[PDB]
Design a protein around this motif. Structure first.
Motif, PDB file in Angstrom:
ATOM      1  N   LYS B 626      49.172 -10.292  23.623  1.00 34.18           N
ATOM      2  CA  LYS B 626      49.306  -8.964  24.231  1.00 34.18           C
ATOM      3  C   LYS B 626      49.621  -7.879  23.194  1.00 34.18           C
ATOM      4  O   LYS B 626      49.029  -6.799  23.254  1.00 34.18           O
TER       5      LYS B 626
ATOM      6  N   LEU C  27      62.572 -12.263  25.009  1.00 31.33           N
ATOM      7  CA  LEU C  27      61.150 -12.231  25.386  1.00 31.33           C
ATOM      8  C   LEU C  27      60.887 -11.362  26.629  1.00 31.33           C
ATOM      9  O   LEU C  27      59.970 -10.544  26.590  1.00 31.33           O
ATOM     10  N   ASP C  28      61.695 -11.456  27.696  1.00 30.22           N
ATOM     11  CA  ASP C  28      61.597 -10.523  28.843  1.00 30.22           C
ATOM     12  C   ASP C  28      61.715  -9.051  28.417  1.00 30.22           C
ATOM     13  O   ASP C  28      60.977  -8.190  28.909  1.00 30.22           O
ATOM     14  N   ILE C  30      60.927  -7.795  25.319  1.00 30.38           N
ATOM     15  CA  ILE C  30      59.661  -7.513  24.615  1.00 30.38           C
ATOM     16  C   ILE C  30      58.535  -7.244  25.618  1.00 30.38           C
ATOM     17  O   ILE C  30      57.895  -6.198  25.535  1.00 30.38           O
ATOM     18  N   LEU C  31      58.334  -8.125  26.603  1.00 32.17           N
ATOM     19  CA  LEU C  31      57.285  -7.989  27.622  1.00 32.17           C
ATOM     20  C   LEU C  31      57.442  -6.697  28.449  1.00 32.17           C
ATOM     21  O   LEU C  31      56.447  -6.056  28.804  1.00 32.17           O
ATOM     22  N   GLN C  33      59.090  -3.796  27.211  1.00 37.33           N
ATOM     23  CA  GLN C  33      58.856  -2.697  26.262  1.00 37.33           C
ATOM     24  C   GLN C  33      57.378  -2.570  25.862  1.00 37.33           C
ATOM     25  O   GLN C  33      56.865  -1.459  25.748  1.00 37.33           O
ATOM     26  N   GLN C  34      56.653  -3.684  25.758  1.00 35.49           N
ATOM     27  CA  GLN C  34      55.196  -3.698  25.601  1.00 35.49           C
ATOM     28  C   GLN C  34      54.481  -2.973  26.735  1.00 35.49           C
ATOM     29  O   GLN C  34      53.462  -2.327  26.499  1.00 35.49           O
ATOM     30  N   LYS C  35      54.994  -3.061  27.970  1.00 35.15           N
ATOM     31  CA  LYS C  35      54.424  -2.294  29.077  1.00 35.15           C
ATOM     32  C   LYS C  35      54.738  -0.800  28.960  1.00 35.15           C
ATOM     33  O   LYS C  35      53.855   0.008  29.212  1.00 35.15           O
ATOM     34  N   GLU C  36      55.947  -0.421  28.554  1.00 36.77           N
ATOM     35  CA  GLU C  36      56.276   0.992  28.318  1.00 36.77           C
ATOM     36  C   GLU C  36      55.354   1.604  27.246  1.00 36.77           C
ATOM     37  O   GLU C  36      54.826   2.697  27.442  1.00 36.77           O
ATOM     38  N   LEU C  37      55.036   0.850  26.188  1.00 38.88           N
ATOM     39  CA  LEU C  37      54.017   1.213  25.199  1.00 38.88           C
ATOM     40  C   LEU C  37      52.588   1.275  25.783  1.00 38.88           C
ATOM     41  O   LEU C  37      51.825   2.179  25.449  1.00 38.88           O
ATOM     42  N   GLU C  38      52.203   0.344  26.656  1.00 39.97           N
ATOM     43  CA  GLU C  38      50.859   0.273  27.255  1.00 39.97           C
ATOM     44  C   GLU C  38      50.579   1.392  28.282  1.00 39.97           C
ATOM     45  O   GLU C  38      49.505   2.012  28.255  1.00 39.97           O
ATOM     46  N   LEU C  40      52.166   4.253  28.092  1.00 38.83           N
ATOM     47  CA  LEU C  40      52.121   5.417  27.182  1.00 38.83           C
ATOM     48  C   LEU C  40      50.795   5.564  26.413  1.00 38.83           C
ATOM     49  O   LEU C  40      50.363   6.689  26.155  1.00 38.83           O
TER      50      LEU C  40
ATOM     51  N   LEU D  42      55.932  -4.438  17.568  1.00 38.69           N
ATOM     52  CA  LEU D  42      56.156  -3.577  18.731  1.00 38.69           C
ATOM     53  C   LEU D  42      56.615  -2.160  18.333  1.00 38.69           C
ATOM     54  O   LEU D  42      56.118  -1.181  18.892  1.00 38.69           O
ATOM     55  N   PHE D  46      54.893   1.626  18.856  1.00 38.46           N
ATOM     56  CA  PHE D  46      55.542   2.863  19.311  1.00 38.46           C
ATOM     57  C   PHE D  46      55.355   4.027  18.323  1.00 38.46           C
ATOM     58  O   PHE D  46      55.118   5.153  18.760  1.00 38.46           O
TER      59      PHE D  46
END
Lengths: 109, 735, 52, 242
Positions: B626, C27-28, C30-31, C33-38, C40, D42, D46
């Motif tokens: 991802k 890991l939860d 990261i998953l 914060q990866q959505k907050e980036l996605e 955005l 990550l 950002f």
């Protein structure tokens, strides 16, 4: 032990008993009574593994334990591996009398 | 081993020398049974019964005086060291005197030099020289059945003329460096030192009486001084000491060294003298006393004093003993220096500093067994006789006592505390507080020969302690020549702390047993504490085939005394040891169970930690794939936000020059790689085209492989100790 | 000797069990914060599709 | 408390599991590294959203366009040029490095092939000369480490108790021609164990007591009451069964 991962654990108990045996070392400042009392513990530990039947999964290792305990019946079951009576005598002294003296020796011979 | 020790207990009391002496004593007994008395009265008291020791030992042989041959009988305690033959019950040597002793012998003494033996009687001394050892066994004259020994009479002309003179006490002078000298004390209050070089003339003479300036009067008052106890009885030597500097004029510098001789009177007064056979007799040998005994005593510490012993310790411990069986433990300390304060009108300006005696405790010996008589008879008679003291040759905190009715052993538990307190620092008060904790001496009745009031005693004739060949072992020989043997404990054990097992258990994470791994004896020492006896039954001498049969009532009380001591001091302590081993074995069975339950839980979590780690890898690679497409969306947007630029910069055009140059350098590098590959291809094919004849196998011998495997061990263990020593220093030197 | 092993073995079981459970939760994060980036990133991918 | 086998099973299955509490720990403490790597990528993400935001608005000025003639490379275009320069110099060196290792092998093949024409035995002494080298390196680090300990004890920073060390051994040849050297060695050892010397003095006098300890011991014993220690008969015969 390298070829047979089923026996290897038991073969290593046998091999480690073959490393705890009190053999006299010529460079070593011990008494005969020290050798004697240590060999008596080693015998009381070898026979202990025969009572919990530790080797009754491989009769060859069960024979090696009786031989190492000075069993005169199991030693005579090995007669086809003892090419003469004086090797049988020295085997019987190693596993039944490690503090033997010249003036005992005639009777064992 | 251990089984080496039981054979000598059954063999030695049955040896032919103890059969000879038990047959001679029968043949002596037939003759004098019938004459009727006629009316006369002997105007004389009976003779003093002197407690005997006519036995000694040397190197591994025991020496018994046979007065019927006038010889020593010599018996060996070393068996044949390998041989399959039994030690011969018939075998001994005789050492016969060339000149026989003209008196009854009550004692023998070996010299410090171990070559000469004093033969000691109430009217004389004779000295025997030991014959030279040789042959396969180190035997006297190489193994002769009888040897003849040189014998020299000492002070003969004084004992053979002075019919009213007797010996009281005698010893060797303490030297291994001089001629052998013997010291005598006689019934004139005079000590006399004799040389074996000059055996009829004394090397030194010390008068013990204050009798200056009244001379030219005769001898008779010897009756009346003795009634007051003004007779010297016994003496013993302390260790070699530097003489107090006040005893010489202020000329000297060399520190004079002499032996302190302690001397006992029949009244129980003690005196000191400093004796040298190496220095001139200027002030050396002056008598010093009476030595003051502290604390003061309202009986005056008895008036029946008979023996003394000076222990080889610092400070000295002087044991004083009585015919009543009392033993006093006098610590010897140097006297005090008085300040000039507030006193008046002393009248001699000549106070020598005299040392003081300090009683630590006293022992009262059961000389014969006390029984339960009635409360109403004020005239039963306590059984007194002359106590004889002996030094232990392997334990400097034990000594032994022989008397007519038995043998007692005595261990001074506090001597180790005294050597602690004096050997720590000058502010250590708590080792002096340990000296105040009531660990008294222990007292041990080993042998009883008068177990009942009615019974005649069997007085000790021989006493010795074997140090090395039977372990530390005691030998006693009776008036009947019966030989009796006890193995001694190698150590004076003090009493242990009270019972380390009144504990209630408390669980947080760790085992209460970790503290009991620190000392390997821990649990066995707790059992050895529970078993620690504080009374025992003495070993009883058998009754004889000539004794009177006792009343049944004495025999009942002797039985009940014995069975009570077994019930209270053995049986109860053995069942307490059993309950302790029952409690200990249970705790180990239940802890062994816990460890299998603990292990079996960790066996299930072995699965748990895997069926978790596997899913953590799954969940990581999901988050990672991802991240890469989010970043490979990012890396596309940034690439579009730079594509709309309408002209080429100075840097775009000049990177384009460098990028146009690199392809021809890549054309050379991409031929150099091929030239190096074709070099490798050619070299490898030229190595291949040699591999068609065999190398010989380099068979390192079974000893040469073991050599390298021993060297690589020595050096690999040297490397371990250097890696260790670097880390040990790094753990100490934290910066 | 057997107890000092088994009691120290048990302490590293609960340690690895704690840290594995920490990784699960980081890991939860990261998953999330990866959505907050996605969420955005995606509006910038729309603006370039109109401008082109 | 048990059999010899029970008390041994309690050791093996403990170690057969302690081994896995390294196996499963090493993977857990490793995965924390790659989870920490992923958090870095990550944060790169950002940052890239905000570079892309600023550059989208920068491209909308009409003045900025006038300066583009004098722009440097963008940092990605120059980082790729710096990587191309790094890889070019690496591919250039490793061509030489591999060329010259292949001649160092090849003249050593010529050297072995020269040596093969004059007989035997070099393949014995490289082994013993390396052992001799390692053994003096062990002695040099040991000489250096003791000199550090002396220095730290000079400085009083270190204090020590006592330690010890090891010795060597050697085995014989078996194959029948040495016996008179084995005996002459034994003969020289017997000659070098033949007898030694003698001494004489007085004894040492024992140490004197401190007068302060002596006066303390007088002042203890002069205050001590001295009740007798009797031979201990049993204090109640009135407990007999008859």
């Amino acid at each position: 032990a390298d070829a047979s991962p089923a026996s290897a654990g038991i073969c290593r108990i046998m091999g480690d008993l073959m490393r705890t045996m009190p053999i006299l070392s010529p460079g070593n400042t011990q008494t005969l009574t020290e050798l004697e009392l240590k060999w008596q513990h080693w015998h009381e530990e070898c026979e202990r593994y025969l009572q919990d039947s530790t080797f009754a999964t491989s009769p060859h290792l069960e024979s090696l334990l009786k031989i190492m305990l000075g069993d005169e019946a199991a030693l005579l079951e090995q007669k086809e591996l003892l090419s003469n009576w004086y090797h049988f005598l020295v085997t019987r002294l190693l596993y039944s009398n490690p503090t033997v003296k010249p003036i005992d020796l005639h009777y064992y011979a | 081993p251990v089984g080496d020790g039981e054979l000598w207990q059954t063999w030695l009391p049955n040896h032919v020398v103890f059969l000879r002496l038990r047959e001679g004593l029968k043949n002596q007994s037939p003759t004098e049974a019938e004459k009727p008395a006629s009316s006369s009265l002997p105007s004389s008291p009976p003779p003093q019964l002197l407690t005997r020791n006519v036995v000694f030992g040397l190197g591994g042989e025991l020496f018994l005086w046979d007065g019927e041959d006038s010889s020593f009988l010599v018996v060996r305690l070393r068996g044949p060291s390998g041989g399959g033959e039994e030690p011969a019950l018939s075998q001994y040597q005789r050492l016969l005197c060339i000149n026989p002793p003209l008196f009854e012998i009550y004692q023998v003494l070996l010299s410090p030099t171990q070559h000469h033996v004093a033969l000691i009687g109430i009217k004389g001394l004779m000295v025997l020289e030991l014959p030279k050892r040789w042959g396969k066994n180190s035997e006297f004259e190489g193994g002769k059945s009888t040897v003849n020994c040189s014998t020299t009479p000492v002070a003969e002309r004084f004992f053979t003329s002075s019919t009213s003179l007797t010996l009281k006490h005698a010893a060797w002078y303490p030297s291994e460096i001089l001629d052998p000298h013997v010291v005598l004390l006689t019934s004139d209050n005079v000590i006399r030192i004799y040389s074996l070089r000059e055996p009829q003339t004394p090397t030194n003479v010390i008068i013990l009486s204050e009798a200056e300036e009244e001379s030219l009067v005769l001898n008779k008052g010897r009756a009346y001084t003795a009634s007051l106890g003004e007779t010297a009885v016994a003496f013993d030597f302390g260790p070699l000491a530097a003489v107090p500097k006040t005893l010489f004029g202020q000329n000297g510098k060399d520190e004079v060294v002499a032996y302190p001789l302690y001397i006992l009177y029949e009244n129980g007064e003690t005196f000191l003298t400093y004796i040298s056979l190496l220095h001139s007799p200027g002030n050396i040998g002056k008598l010093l006393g009476p030595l003051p005994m502290h604390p003061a005593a309202e009986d005056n510490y008895g008036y029946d004093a008979c023996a003394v012993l000076c222990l080889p310790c610092v400070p000295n411990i002087l044991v004083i003993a009585t015919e009543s069986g009392m033993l006093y433990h006098c610590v010897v300390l140097e006297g005090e220096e008085e300040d000039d304060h507030t006193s008046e009108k002393s009248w001699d300006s000549r106070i020598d500093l005299i040392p003081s005696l300090y009683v630590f405790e006293c022992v009262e010996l059961e000389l014969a067994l006390k029984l339960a008589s009635g409360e109403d008879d004020p005239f039963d008679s306590d059984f007194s006789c002359p106590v004889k003291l002996h030094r232990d040759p392997k334990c400097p905190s034990r000594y032994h006592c022989t008397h007519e009715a038995g043998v007692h052993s005595v261990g001074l538990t506090w001597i180790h505390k005294l050597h602690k307190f004096l050997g720590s620092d000058e502010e250590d008060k708590d080792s002096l507080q340990e000296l105040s904790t009531e660990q008294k001496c222990f007292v041990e009745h080993i042998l009883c020969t008068k177990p009942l009031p009615c019974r005649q005693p069997a007085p000790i004739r021989g006493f010795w302690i074997v140090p090395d060949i039977l372990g530390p072992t005691m030998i006693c020989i009776t008036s009947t020549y019966e030989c009796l043997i006890w193995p001694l404990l190698s150590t004076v054990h003090p009493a242990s702390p009270p019972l380390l097992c009144t504990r209630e258990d408390v669980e947080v994470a760790e085992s209460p047993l970790r503290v009991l791994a620190e000392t390997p004896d821990s649990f066995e020492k707790h059992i050895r504490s529970i078993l620690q006896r504080s009374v025992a039954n003495p070993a009883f001498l058998k009754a004889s085939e000539k004794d009177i049969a006792p009343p049944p009532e004495e025999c009942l009380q002797l039985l009940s005394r014995a069975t009570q001591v077994f019930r209270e001091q053995y049986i109860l302590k053995q069942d307490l040891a059993k309950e302790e081993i029952q409690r200990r074995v249970k705790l180990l069975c239940d802890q062994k169970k816990k460890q299998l339950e603990d292990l079996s839980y960790c066996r299930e979590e072995r699965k748990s930690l895997r069926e978790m780690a596997e899913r953590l890898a799954d969940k990581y690679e999901e988050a990672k794939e991802k991240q890469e497409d989010i970043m490979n969306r990012m890396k596309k947007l940034l690439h579009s936000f730079h594509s709309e630029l309408p002209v080429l910069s100075d840097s775009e055009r000049d990177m384009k020059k460098e990028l146009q140059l690199i392809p021809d350098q890549l054309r050379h590098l991409g031929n150099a790689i091929k030239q190096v590959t074709m070099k490798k291809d050619y070299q490898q094919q030229k190595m291949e085209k040699v591999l068609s004849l065999p190398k010989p196998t380099i068979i390192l011998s079974a000893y040469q492989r073991k050599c390298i495997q021993s060297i690589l061990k020595e050096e690999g263990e040297h490397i371990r100790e250097m890696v260790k020593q670097i880390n040990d220093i790094r753990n100490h030197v934290n910066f | 000797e057997n107890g000092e092993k088994i009691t120290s073995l048990h302490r590293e079981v609960e340690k690895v069990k704690l840290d594995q459970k920490r990784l699960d939760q980081e890991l939860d994060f990261i998953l999330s914060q990866q959505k907050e980036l996605e969420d955005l990133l995606s509006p910038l991918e729309e603006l370039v599709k109109e401008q082109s | 408390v048990g059999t010899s086998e029970e008390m041994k099973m309690l050791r093996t299955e403990s170690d057969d599991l302690h081994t896995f509490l390294l196996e499963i720990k090493e993977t857990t403490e490793s995965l924390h590294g790659d989870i920490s790597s992923l958090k870095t990528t990550l944060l790169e993400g950002f940052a890239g959203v905000e570079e892309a935001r600023e550059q989208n608005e920068r491209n909308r000025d009409s003045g900025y366009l006038h300066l583009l003639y004098k722009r440097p490379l963008d940092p990605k275009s120059e980082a790729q040029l710096q990587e191309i320069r790094r890889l070019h110099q690496y591919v250039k060196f490793a061509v030489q490095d591999v060329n010259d290792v292949l001649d160092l092998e090849w003249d050593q093949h010529l050297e072995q092939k020269k040596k093969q024409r004059h007989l035997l035995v070099p393949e014995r002494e490289t082994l013993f000369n390396t052992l001799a080298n390692n053994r003096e390196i062990i002695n040099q680090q040991r000489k250096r480490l003791n000199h550090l300990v002396d220095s730290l004890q000079q400085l009083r920073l270190y204090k020590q108790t006592s330690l010890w060390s090891l010795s060597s051994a050697v085995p014989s040849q078996s194959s029948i021609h040495s016996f008179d050297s084995d005996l002459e060695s034994l003969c020289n050892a017997l000659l070098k164990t033949t007898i030694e010397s003698h001494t004489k003095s007085l004894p040492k006098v024992p140490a004197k007591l401190s007068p302060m300890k002596q006066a303390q011991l007088r002042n203890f014993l002069a205050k001590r009451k001295t009740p007798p220690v009797r031979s201990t008969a049993p204090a109640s015969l009135s407990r007999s069964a008859f």
